[PDB]
Design a protein around this ligand. Structure first.
Ligand SMILES: [Mg+2]
Ligand SMILES: [Mg+2]
Lengths: 274, 100, 207, 49, 291
RNA sequence: UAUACAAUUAUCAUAUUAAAUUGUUAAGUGCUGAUUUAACCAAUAAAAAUAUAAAUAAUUUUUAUUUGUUUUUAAACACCAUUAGGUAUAUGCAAAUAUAAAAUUAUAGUAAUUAUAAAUUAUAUUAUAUUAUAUUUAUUCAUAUAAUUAAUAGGAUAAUAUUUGUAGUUUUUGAUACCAUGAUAAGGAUUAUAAAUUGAAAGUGUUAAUAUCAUAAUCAAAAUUUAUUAUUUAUAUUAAAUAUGUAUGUGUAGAUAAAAUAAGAAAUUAAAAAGGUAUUGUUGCCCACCAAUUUUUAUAAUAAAAAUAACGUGCAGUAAUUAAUAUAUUUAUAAAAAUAUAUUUUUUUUUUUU
């Protein structure tokens, strides 16, 4: 028992005062006022710019290999790749990061000539800072991974070459120094360099041995004369209740009739008595 | 705001301003001085009372054709930033790109 | 217009048998002229007569294009040419012409390259190669027994020690495999086996 | 606020006017509210003011 | 109704975009544009208008205003010339201009008559009260009901009832002083251009009402302005209270068809599109003979 | 999921200080027989008349008990019958709207709020009074046929063109034998004498957007079955485009047409109130039953309640076609209907000692 207009919403049917059901507009005395005013400043000042515009229209094509892109766009592509690469947690040691930084540095070296950006002094302060940060990061990663990958010396040498062609003397000298250091420090970590040196259990590991010793000494002592070596049972299991208070099912005491009644067959007439 | 002041296109704004300029130029200096219609005051382009009798839907179509009512025109979307022209061509909202 | 009724859904099956209404032979959405009375056919003819429509020459053929509409009173059997079913026929014809008409989201970057970019990629470990010392040295570092600085030193210093052999008794069914293993073990366990066949892999040390 | 309401002058003469409620205020301590109905938004605003 | 919304149900047309009514902008902002006005201005400008137009005709407004009632009356009067008719709109305008000041006359008559014992109007205190309230009513700063309440509740004298027990037996005072004060206030205040009009209205609206049932008794609701009011002809002190205008007119069987066949004055002239067969209001199909 | 009714007036079962109860009268032919009613009708048909003065307001009504079924002469009178009759009035059995309340529905679990209000909508002149209406005339009413619609091209009396005689097949598709948007007509009932007209806007075949076999078109000599049309009546009768052979029957049934304008016509007439539960607005909401799916309480061969746009039977309610509301009885395809009693969210009509 509930009336409900299917064609129209009930609220829309009910709100008689808000809407008008009649659809005929009659003249009568229903005058309407059309008032239009304007000012001289509306002719020039305060004109909005529409969102859609043919000037800011771009056809975006895609390609996978980096060589297709110009160096200017290739630098942004490399940085976009490094954005997702730098989230990898490897204790800031690796080879892929050094390769990516080397690719960015090679992009700078190419754009020096093909991209006609100019020289290091020609490049303003912010891009100088970006270049210095990139080369320093490449050097740090190459040094970190040098002891494992013996090609980090080549990475550092290419970075030094790129600094040379970018004409940064202060960074080039440091790159020369670090390349000289690494070219002789790379072989130290290997085994043949240090034949003098050679190659501990945890607390849990030692306590496991202690427990095993106790179990064995109880086994040989009481395994035959009196089987009391069994540990205390945990057959009672906690079940979660209203406020997560663990309820424990205490086993029934022997001095009750419940277990005596339970052990008997349910139907004496039909169930076997043996 | 959008109810009291309906949005209108830049072409309509320019047309309104040019109509005001034309009315001001057509007016004479003596009558302008008498009426105190200096360039500061906004000029009233027109004002009239109309009366329309007929079916509601056809009256709506007629008014839309005559430009008497709007409320359904799809005006172009405005720029996300400062929509007013003449702003700096390159201006990032976040400065960023800082060193040290 | 909508084939589904406005009531709550009900169980399709009884204890073991299918409900006759939802059974294929007795489908509730199919007009069966054999099992329906005369008054439903009379209503169908009256509906096709009051509105300008062709009369039903054949009911068995008409049932193929008959359309069911759930109503509070019950099923409403209507023709595919009927104005009431015109909208549903429009949608069904469009579906039969081309099904793919719902926009599909653009897939992202390839998951393999996403894995290469994954933050936890360096924590992966692989099974050691028995004949490769570098693999077991790297896995020593991965398990945390040695230093990553000492990976190469351990790879050079790793010694190889022989291990007891592992031999798999394989063959056809009922070919004495379990009996041979029992005689090797000096035990008799084939007889107690359930069904007289081996059903689980068993590894046992023998001298 | 703004709203829409029906106005009935004659049994066969129905129109839809709009209802405007507003107020005018000045922190010097003077304020006053108003509400009106009129055929158009501008007329409703002026009558409410 | 034939619109897009109605036609979508009447007869579904797959061509939804269709201009039912051609675009024709009657307004002035839409028609013009800067490119049009740049060319238009050189040919049509203020200087060019001054050069090619002949001269056919606050303080300056008051200097040029003259007498508003006379300027309104002369239009209706001159409507009797050979090239124009006696327009009823002109008489309506003249009536409005003449009766624009009737509200103050109504209020002054109410204060003079309805108040049973206003006291001594000659006294400067009561005179100032009446003058201030009349000025407020004329300016519109105070409504008539509240002004009348102020007049009847204003402070006059301590022990007013006890003092009136000496003079008035029934509490009704002579109206000569009240009428004199109500004339004097309007004489002093520049209400109307003609000084005698105020006195004549005050006297006439009283002498005309004096011969009606309950001449000085007024219901509180209808005595002044209110949400529910009376007809202008049925108001208490109205200038059009007494009339015997024709209210019954005989009608023939063809009247609803020949409503416009007489000597009607058309606000909108009938056209062939609307009226299929109608010669006009000036024709006579059965003319007489004149010398 | 936790988180501030009211107490100055709330319509369904919360009655508690109140004077009641009982009178002993009326009416009594058979006569020559048509009473009542929209209609049918039944059997002697006339009748029951008496009041006030008087019972404290309270501190334990916590307390007895109590609210129109109450049994017989007539008049009234519900099931049922159909030719048409039967059938209810306090003596007992019976707490009960005159309200100390917490959004609808529902057993206090089922759905997601439920009700209600205002404005408007075609039924009711009143009797001097914005008009006397009332007379004359007329009525056998019929016509339709033989198919091709898609370019410009100049001449005598002019200073000169053979352009005398100007020569490029074939890719589109609707006003046609349906349908293929709009738009003019006919239809007199209240603005009148006066220097004046007695024909309306609410729409009539052809006309401007929906397509998808369409050659339907007069240039004569032609084929009543179809509503919407004034024909000549008894002395003289067929000559030019070919032009009506049928029906004499007491100015004659029913039914029906026209006129109060350069014509001739004259006292009883227009002029009140009074409604939406509908908003998709009567072609409307809504009602149970029928029919179809399904949920909840339940396991007892249970019962109850709830949701749902199209069916079937109806028309119960909505001033709604014999008014509606409440309780009791009764009938049953279903809304409901009829009675007994009590009410009007039923729209209303003037008697201050004749
Ligand atoms: Mg085996
Ligand atoms: Mg009914």
């Amino acid at each position: 028992l509930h009336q409900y207009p299917t064609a129209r919403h009930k609220s829309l049917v009910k709100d008689r005062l808000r809407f008008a059901r009649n659809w005929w507009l009659t003249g009568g005395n229903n005058y309407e006022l059309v008032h239009e005013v304007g000012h001289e400043r509306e002719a020039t000042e305060c004109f909005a710019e529409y969102a859609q515009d043919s000037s800011r229209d771009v056809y975006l094509m895609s390609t996978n290999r980096l060589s297709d892109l110009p160096p200017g766009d290739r630098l942004k592509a490399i940085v976009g790749l490094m954005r997702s690469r730098w989230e990898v947690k490897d204790a800031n040691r690796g080879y892929d990061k050094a390769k990516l930084l080397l690719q960015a540095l090679e992009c700078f070296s190419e754009m020096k000539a093909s991209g006609q950006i100019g020289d290091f002094n020609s490049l303003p302060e912010p891009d100088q800072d970006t270049f210095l940060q990139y080369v320093e990061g490449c050097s740090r990663f190459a040094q970190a991974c040098s002891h494992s990958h013996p090609d980090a010396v080549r990475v550092l040498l290419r970075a030094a070459q790129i600094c040379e062609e970018m004409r940064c003397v202060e960074k080039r000298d440091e790159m020369i120094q670090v390349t000289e250091a690494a070219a002789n420090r790379m072989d130290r970590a290997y085994a043949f360099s240090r034949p003098h040196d050679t190659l501990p259990p945890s607390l849990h590991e030692n306590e496991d041995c202690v427990r095993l010793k106790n179990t064995e000494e109880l086994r040989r002592r009481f395994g035959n004369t009196a089987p009391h070596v069994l540990e205390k049972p945990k057959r009672v299991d906690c079940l979660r209740i209203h406020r997560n208070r663990p309820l424990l099912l205490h086993p029934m005491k022997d001095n009750n009739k419940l277990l005596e009644l339970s052990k008997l067959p349910a139907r004496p007439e039909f169930d076997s008595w043996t | 705001d959008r109810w009291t002041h309906p949005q209108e296109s830049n072409l309509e704004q320019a047309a309104r301003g040019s109509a005001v300029l034309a009315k001001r130029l057509s007016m004479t200096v003596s009558e302008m001085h008498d009426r105190q219609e200096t360039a500061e005051n906004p000029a009233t382009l027109d004002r009239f009372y109309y009366r329309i009798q007929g079916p509601a839907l056809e009256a709506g179509e007629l008014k839309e054709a005559l430009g008497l009512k709007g409320n359904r025109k799809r005006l172009p979307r405005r720029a996300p930033g400062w929509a007013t022209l003449g702003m700096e061509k390159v201006s990032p909202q976040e400065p960023g790109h800082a060193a040290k | 217009q909508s084939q589904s009724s406005r009531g709550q859904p009900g169980l399709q099956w009884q204890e073991g048998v299918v409900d006759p209404r939802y059974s294929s032979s007795g489908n509730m959405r199919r007009f069966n002229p054999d099992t329906v009375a005369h008054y439903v056919k009379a209503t169908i003819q009256n509906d096709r007569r009051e509105m300008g429509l062709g009369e039903v020459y054949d009911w068995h053929e008409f049932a193929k294009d008959a359309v069911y509409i759930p109503t509070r009173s019950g099923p409403l059997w209507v023709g595919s040419d009927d104005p009431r079913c015109a909208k549903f026929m429009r949608r069904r014809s469009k579906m039969q012409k081309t099904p793919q008409q719902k926009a599909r989201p653009k897939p992202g970057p390839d998951p393999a390259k996403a894995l290469e970019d994954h933050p936890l990629r360096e924590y992966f470990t692989t099974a050691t190669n028995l004949r490769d010392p570098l693999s077991t040295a790297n896995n020593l570092h991965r398990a945390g027994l040695i230093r990553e600085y000492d990976i190469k030193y351990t790879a050079a210093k790793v010694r190889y020690v022989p291990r007891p052999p592992v031999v798999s008794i394989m063959g056809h069914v009922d070919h004495g495999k379990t009996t041979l293993l029992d005689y090797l073990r000096k035990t008799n366990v084939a007889s107690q086996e359930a069904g007289g066949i081996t059903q689980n892999v068993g590894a046992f040390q023998v001298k | 606020a703004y709203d829409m309401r029906v106005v009935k002058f004659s049994p066969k003469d129905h129109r839809q006017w709009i209802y405007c409620v507003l107020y005018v205020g000045s922190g010097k301590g003077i304020a006053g509210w108003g509400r009106a109905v009129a055929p158009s938004t501008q007329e409703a605003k002026k009558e409410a003011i | 109704d034939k619109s897009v919304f109605a036609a979508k149900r009447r007869v579904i047309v797959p061509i939804h975009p269709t201009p039912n009514f051609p675009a024709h902008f009657i307004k002035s902002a839409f028609t013009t544009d800067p490119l049009k006005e740049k060319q238009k201005a050189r040919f049509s400008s203020g200087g060019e208008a001054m050069r090619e137009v002949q001269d056919i005709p606050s303080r300056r407004d008051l200097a040029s205003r003259g007498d508003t009632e006379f300027q309104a009356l002369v239009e209706f009067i001159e409507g009797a010339s050979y090239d124009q008719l006696i327009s009823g709109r002109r008489f309506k305008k003249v009536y409005d201009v003449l009766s624009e000041n009737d509200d103050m006359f109504i209020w002054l008559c109410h204060t003079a008559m309805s108040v049973l014992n206003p006291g001594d109007m000659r006294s400067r205190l009561i005179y100032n009260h009446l003058r201030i309230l009349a000025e407020s009513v004329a300016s519109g700063e105070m409504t008539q009901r509240t002004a009348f309440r102020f007049f009847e509740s204003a402070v006059r004298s301590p022990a007013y009832r006890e003092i009136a027990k000496r003079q008035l037996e029934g509490g009704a005072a002579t109206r000569l002083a009240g009428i004199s004060a109500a004339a004097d206030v309007m004489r002093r205040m520049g209400l109307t251009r003609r000084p005698m009009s105020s006195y004549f209205e005050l006297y006439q609206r009283i002498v005309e009402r004096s011969e009606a049932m309950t001449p000085w008794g007024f219901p509180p609701l209808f005595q002044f302005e209110e949400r529910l009011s009376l007809e202008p002809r049925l108001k208490f002190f109205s200038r059009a209270s007494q009339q015997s205008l024709e209210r019954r007119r005989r009608g023939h069987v063809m009247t609803p068809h020949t409503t416009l066949h007489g000597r009607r004055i058309f606000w909108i002239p009938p056209t062939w599109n609307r009226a299929g067969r109608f010669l006009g209001p000036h024709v006579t199909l059965y003319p007489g003979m004149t010398p």
